[PDB]
Structure formats: structure tokens, C-alpha cells
DNA sequence: CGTACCAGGTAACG
DNA sequence: CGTACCAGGTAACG
């Protein structure tokens, strides 16, 4: 899934993506390509092996904070 | 609760205690002494401010691992 | 078959 | 009122 990640996302400045929607997109890709998906923790290992320097933020109002990969955006 | 911790537990070698039963004992102490208990994360901050050098282990058979504070035992 | 490296709650920053 | 420092799953060690 390294090339699929590179084709769909890229490191960028000052923007972030919620981790769930990114993992959710990966699960569709996996299902569509008949690949058995890894879990969210394993996916975190994969994405950090592809995109260097990602930071962790938790965005949202109190009681509603959600993890984001900071420094990443949709490429296409 | 610093003195209650020191009166009931001590650092020791080669032995561990499950985190849950220790926090469960703290909750009884809190209830019995009419003190509002802090949550498990806050309790982890408290116990590490009292007992220096505690290590983390997860003991148990596959699928059943549970966190332990390694290097601690019941004093009394 | 019993760790490594990834993946929310409360106090308190700013 | 939107981070710091605490709190299970899978691969793979040994």
C-alpha cells in the first residue's frame, strides 16, 4: 500500500487530516483491491514509514477531541 | 494519599502488582475516607511521584495480557 | 507462546 | 476553552 499512499496523500505544511477518515479510506482501498487490511495501529506504523515527520494533534471541542496526522493532505 | 500509599505498598525487587487491583484498593480507601477518587490515569501520575523506578509489564496469556506495575509489592 | 510500536481522560497551558 | 502525561492489538522476540 506504499504506492497507494503516495498516490493519494502527501506531506504538507500547516494542514492535518483526521486519522479515522484516512484509515477508513485505506479500508475501502483494501476491500476494493481484495487485500486483507491491517488494523489501525499497524496502519500507523505503515504511514509513518512512508511520510516522514508527521505530528500528532487532537482537534475538536472539549469531550470531542479526535486524533489527526498533522502535516499531511490529500494529494489527489 | 501519599502516606496511604507508603503505608500500604513499597518498592521491591522482582515482583509486580496488577494495576487494576492497586487502583481498586485506592478506590475503597477513597470511598471509606470520604475523598473523591482521581481516575486511573491521574492515579498513575500519583503513584509514580511516590514510588521511583516502577516499570511497566503486561502479564498474562495471549489475548489476556494486563498491565502491572513491576517493582512494587504490598507492604502490609 | 508469554514486548515494541503503534493505536481516551483530566488538569492546566495560553 | 481548544496539550501533557498518564491510562489494547498484532507481529515477532526469544
From Swiss-Prot, chains A, B:
Instruction: List localization entries.
Output: Nucleus
Q: Which residues bind DNA?
A: 1-76
Q: Which domain of life is it from?
A: Eukaryota
Free-text function comment from the UniProt entry? Regulatory factor essential for MHC class II genes expression. Binds to the X boxes of MHC class II genes. Also binds to an inverted repeat (ENH1) required for hepatitis B virus genes expression and to the most upstream element (alpha) of the RPL30 promoter.
Assembly mode: Homodimer; binds DNA as a homodimer. Heterodimer; heterodimerizes with RFX2 and RFX3.
Family the UniProt entry places it in: Belongs to the RFX family.
What name appears for this protein in its UniProt entry? MHC class II regulatory factor RFX1
- What species does this protein belong to? Homo sapiens
Which part of the full protein is shown?
A: 438 to 513 of 979
Amino acid at each position: 500500500t506504499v504506492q497507494w499512499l503516495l498516490d493519494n496523500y502527501e506531506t504538507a505544511e500547516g494542514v492535518s487530516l483526521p486519522r479515522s477518515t484516512l484509515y477508513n479510506h485505506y479500508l475501502l482501498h483494501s476491500q476494493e483491491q481484495k487485500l486483507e487490511p491491517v488494523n489501525a495501529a499497524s496502519f500507523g506504523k505503515l504511514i509513518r514509514s512512508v511520510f516522514m515527520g508527521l505530528r500528532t494533534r487532537r482537534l475538536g471541542t472539549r469531550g470531542n477531541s479526535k486524533y489527526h496526522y498533522y502535516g499531511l493532505r490529500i494529494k489527489a
